[PDB]
Amino acid sequence: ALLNIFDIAGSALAAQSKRLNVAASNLANADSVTGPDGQPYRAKQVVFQVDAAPGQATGGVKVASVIESQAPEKLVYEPGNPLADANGYVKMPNVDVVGEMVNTMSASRSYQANIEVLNTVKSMMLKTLTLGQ
């Protein structure tokens, strides 16, 4: 099974990939008007926690769940839209495009950093294998 820093960096890579996928989903459907069941597309976010196992606040990251933003959805005026409420307002996603771009960049750089950490640890233990030549 994955051992130590390998487990830690693998968990970090997986969670950063999940974060980037959620950011890409939010940024792609920032203008979607409806979902498959008629409800608006509410922006999704990831929730990060510390693996920890039971007694070690020293572990990787793990994505506990994907939460849906409860911030009020933007309202636009369209009385002809079938999805409009009794007041004629259509709900639109609450995506902050700048926030999504910054999140994508941050997931990218953190992903790269953990890749570098994993490579360094792999080289270190490969050289450890030749202890005493």
Binding site: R19, Q45, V46, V47, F48, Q49, V50, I67, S69, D96, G99, E100, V102, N103, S106
Partner: peptide, 16 residues
């Protein structure tokens, strides 16, 4: 313990 990482936890929010 933790919460949403990135956008939703790095903006000024009303107390609650």
């Amino acid at each position: 313990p933790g919460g949403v990482p990135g956008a939703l936890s790095n903006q000024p929010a009303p107390p609650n």
